[PDB]
């Protein structure tokens, strides 16, 4: 799978879940991170719940000496709800996108400069991001599915 390719050759891995667990389908990334914490025990892998502030974890990420850093987030990319995307968060997208807060590109560029790590973003298309909403059943299922796919790669 393309996922497997992402992880291939990479020994030390940091997986960073981004999201908000009370903002409907925006819970996606934190759901993934929390589920991975239950499924992955190896000393070569660090799982972080970054909430909405991955920039606050750059120190700890760099100190882990990663080969690969994987950000996991709900991403609006015009897909069907629940659809996955694998993207390069270092890439400059231009004016067609506007950036909420500190863009992930800046975070990822700093981490890669500091460590030499590859960086990847795995996104899932959300369908509803209302404040004080539970995630949809579909997004919960997609988070559980991605955590399983990643754990089966990592255990392996």
Our CA angle for 93, 97, 102, nearest 5°, is 90
Question: What is the C-alpha to C-alpha distance for residues 139 and 149, in angstroms, rounded to an integer?
Answer: 15
Taking residue 152's Cβ as centre, other Cβ atoms within 10 Å add up to 13
> What b/e readout covers 42-62, taking b as 16+ CB neighbours within 10 angstroms?
eeebbbbbbbbebeebbeebb
Tokens 């629940």 belong to which residue? 82
DSSP per-residue codes, 74-139: E--SS--TT-EEEE-TTS---TTS--SSS-HHHHHHHHHHHH--EEEEEEE--S---TTBPPPHHH
Closest CA to 87 of 3, 156, 8, 1: 3
Q: Residue 14: how many CA atoms within 13 Å on its side-chain side?
A: 26
Widest Cα–Cα separation across the chain: 41
Which residues, 6+ apart, have CB-to-CB distance to 21 below 8 Å? 27, 30, 31, 135
Place of tokens 């404040």: 131
> In this structure, what DSSP letter does residue 19 have?
-
Q: How far apart are CA 130 and CA 151, in angstroms?
A: 29
Question: How was this model experimentally determined?
Answer: X-ray
Please, are residues 29 and 73 in contact by the beta-carbon 8 Å criterion? yes
């Amino acid at each position: 799978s393309v996922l497997e390719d992402v992880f291939s050759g990479k020994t030390r891995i940091v997986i960073c879940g981004i999201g908000n667990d009370v903002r409907g389908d925006d819970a996606f990334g934190v759901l993934v991170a929390e589920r991975l914490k239950e499924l992955v025990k190896t000393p070569d892998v660090l799982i972080l719940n970054c909430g909405e502030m991955p920039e606050s974890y750059v120190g700890k990420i760099a100190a882990f000496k990663p080969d690969l850093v994987v950000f996991v987030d709900a991403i609006h990319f015009g897909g069907e709800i629940g659809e996955f995307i694998i993207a390069d968060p270092l890439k400059t997208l231009g004016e067609a996108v506007s950036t909420h807060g500190l863009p992930l590109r800046i975070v990822a560029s700093y981490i890669k400069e500091q460590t030499g790590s590859d960086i990847v973003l795995i996104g899932c298309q959300p369908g509803s991001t209302g404040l004080f909403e539970e995630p949809s059943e579909l997004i919960k299922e997609r988070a559980e599915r991605l955590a399983e796919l990643i754990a089966e790669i990592l255990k392996n």
